[PDB]
Each structure stands twice: as C-alpha cells, then as structure tokens.
Design a protein around this ligand. Structure first.
Ligand code: BMF
Length: 121
C-alpha cells in the first residue's frame, strides 16, 4: 500500500477518535463467534471487519486508497446492523460511532495525494 493525506487522516483523526470512544470495545477486535456461541455469525456475515483490523492495516500501510479503508469501516458497521436486532443497544452504539465516522470524514482532505516525497523524475 502507500501513505496518502487521506489515509493519514483516516488513521490519525478518524480512527483516533473512534478507537477511544466509550462505545468502541465490541468493535476493537473481530467478533469471536466460537467464544460467543454464534455458529451462524459467519454464515450471515461473509466479510467480517473490525477496528483492530483496520487500525493494523493503517499502521502497516496496507491500503492503497482511502476509499478502501472507508469501505472497511462501512462493512464493519453494516455487518452489525445486518446481524443484530433493531432494538439492541449494540446497534445504537454502531450508529453513534458511524455518525462520528461520517462527521470526521466530512473534513478529510479533498484530493488523495501521496505524502512520501520521492526524488524528482
Ligand atoms: C445476541 C446475539 O448477537 C450478538 O451477540 N451480537 C454481537 C456481540 C458482540 C460481542 C458481545 C460480547 C463480547 C464479549 C464481544 N467480544 S468480541 C469483539 O471479542 O467478540 C462481542 N459483538 N457484536 C458485534 C461487533 N456485532 N454483533 C455483535
């Protein structure tokens, strides 16, 4: 992957705010369907995603484009809405985190630019 202004923003602004939020803990590592006794979790949720995975990917320059990281956040949130029941608190927690995600994304740099300057030519 690479380091861009938008990915750096997703790491140092967006993930920094979401990771430390009071509602973050169920999303900080993959859903552990075995420990949770949920044999249908991986039958219903075909692309699991969580903030621990996204954070490690940002730390390791896994992404080539901010849009890929944004889609991972979206998948994490949508997985939660799809698997759980409308009135569960976890849905409200996902919704609260997603609102912050969108609020912070609104101030992301407009043009995706590489931050690593290379020798000209
Ligand atoms: C009622 C049946 O539905 C569910 O249990 N739903 C979900 C449950 C939990 C969940 C609970 C308890 C614990 C201890 C954990 N820890 S973890 C991240 O290691 O697996 C997670 N996360 N979750 C996420 C995200 N999305 N849905 C759920």
């Amino acid at each position: 992957g690479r380091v861009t202004n938008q990915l750096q923003y997703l790491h140092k602004v967006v993930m920094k705010a979401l990771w430390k939020h009071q509602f973050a803990w169920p999303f900080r590592q993959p859903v552990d369907a075995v420990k949770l006794g949920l044999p249908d979790y991986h039958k219903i949720i075909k692309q699991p995603m969580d903030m621990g995975t996204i954070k490690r990917r940002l730390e390791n320059n896994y992404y080539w484009a901010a849009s890929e990281c944004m889609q991972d956040f979206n998948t994490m949130f949508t997985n939660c809405y799809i698997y759980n029941k409308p009135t569960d608190d976890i849905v409200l927690m996902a919704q609260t985190l997603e609102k912050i995600f969108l609020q912070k994304v609104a101030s992301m740099p407009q043009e995706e630019q590489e931050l690593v300057v290379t020798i000209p030519k």
